[PDB]
């Protein structure tokens, strides 16, 4: 028997023993057999896995660490094109997955059928592994060879919702880390704080200040704290201040004032909130609006000041 062929045969015995040590989690045996010549060896049969594939799939955390520390190729492929990250994700091995990612595993690696690690985690309902993957930039919209995404494979509505939410979330965080302004804007394009009623162009803030219910003040404050446009105009060019003022909802007028409501904003009739308060006879509303710096001399498009539209008591308040 040729000396080279004897050497190869001995090495094949040895590599099978290395693979066995990797699968079983046998640290001492692994470190006795592991050399620069077999660290990235492949099994002869079955999936043709490397030691790292086997340690990853069988949740041998210490073995994964030793292999990575002594030269193992985190990008090595089995016969189907799986990388070790695929094995760790399919079987839901969280610690292993995190170690592989720390050592540079490609989060969206594709096998020969374009399955990613997230396809594997999602299809087997590995919820925490899915969240870990998304936090390293996994993309749940990438399609495999059957036209199917990780979202399509997620077996529950809860997981599907979570993949979509966390993908969008991590997309925003990463765009913020890169100060990618166009990507931040795109990711925020469907926020609902300033959603508009399609017919009236009213927002939640217009609706809250019009409310008859007890906590309108608190709701309005909240909407404003969470990004409501204080001066948003409906179809008739009415701001929330116009809406509050014409109903004498004085508590919410205070909130709007505090958040920079524009006192002299003009509706489509050239009227201020003060015109509307005056026209409706809301006496305290008028005093309040004047104290906020509403201008009583503004002439509407019909040619009227607030005083020319109001009752005797309004006319007196406005002549002060």
């Amino acid at each position: 028997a040729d000396p080279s062929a004897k050497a190869v045969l001995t090495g094949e015995y040895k590599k099978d023993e290395l693979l066995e040590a990797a699968r079983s989690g046998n640290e001492e045996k692994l470190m006795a057999l592991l050399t620069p010549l077999n660290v990235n060896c492949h099994a002869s049969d079955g999936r043709k896995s490397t030691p790292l594939h086997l340690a990853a799939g069988y949740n041998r955390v210490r073995i994964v660490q030793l292999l990575l520390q002594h030269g193992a190729d985190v990008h090595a492929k089995d016969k189907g094109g799986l990388v070790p990250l695929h094995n760790a994700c399919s079987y839901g091995h969280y610690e292993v997955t995190e170690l592989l990612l720390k050592h540079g595993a490609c989060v969206n690696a594709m096998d020969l059928w374009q399955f990613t690690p997230l396809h594997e985690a999602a299809s087997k309902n590995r919820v925490e592994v899915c969240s870990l993957l998304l936090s390293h930039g996994a993309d749940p919209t990438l399609v495999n060879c059957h036209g199917k995404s990780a979202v399509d494979m997620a077996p529950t509505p809860e997981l599907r919702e979570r993949l979509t939410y966390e993908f969008k979330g991590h997309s925003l965080l990463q765009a913020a880390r890169e100060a990618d302004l166009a990507k931040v804007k795109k990711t925020l394009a469907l926020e609902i704080i300033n959603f508009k009623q399609p017919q009236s162009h009213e927002t939640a803030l217009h609706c809250a200040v019009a409310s008859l219910h007890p906590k309108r003040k608190q709701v309005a404050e909240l909407l404003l704290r969470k990004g409501a446009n204080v001066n948003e105009k409906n179809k008739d060019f009415m701001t929330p201040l116009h809406v509050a003022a014409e109903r004498a909802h004085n508590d919410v007028m205070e909130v709007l004032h505090k958040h920079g409501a524009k006192m002299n904003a003009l509706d489509s009739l050239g009227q201020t909130a003060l015109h509307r308060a005056a026209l409706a006879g809301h006496l305290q509303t008028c005093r309040l609006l004047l104290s906020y710096g509403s201008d009583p001399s503004i002439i509407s498009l019909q040619g009227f000041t607030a005083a020319q539209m109001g009752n005797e008591a309004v006319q007196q308040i406005l002549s002060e």
């Binding site: 999936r47 594939h53 086997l54 799939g57 069988y58 949740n59 089995d78 079987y91 091995h93 399955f115």
Partner: peptide
């Protein structure tokens, strides 16, 4: 024909 089962275990 893809084999569904990577090497490993739950």
């Amino acid at each position: 024909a893809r084999e569904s089962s990577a090497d490993g275990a739950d």
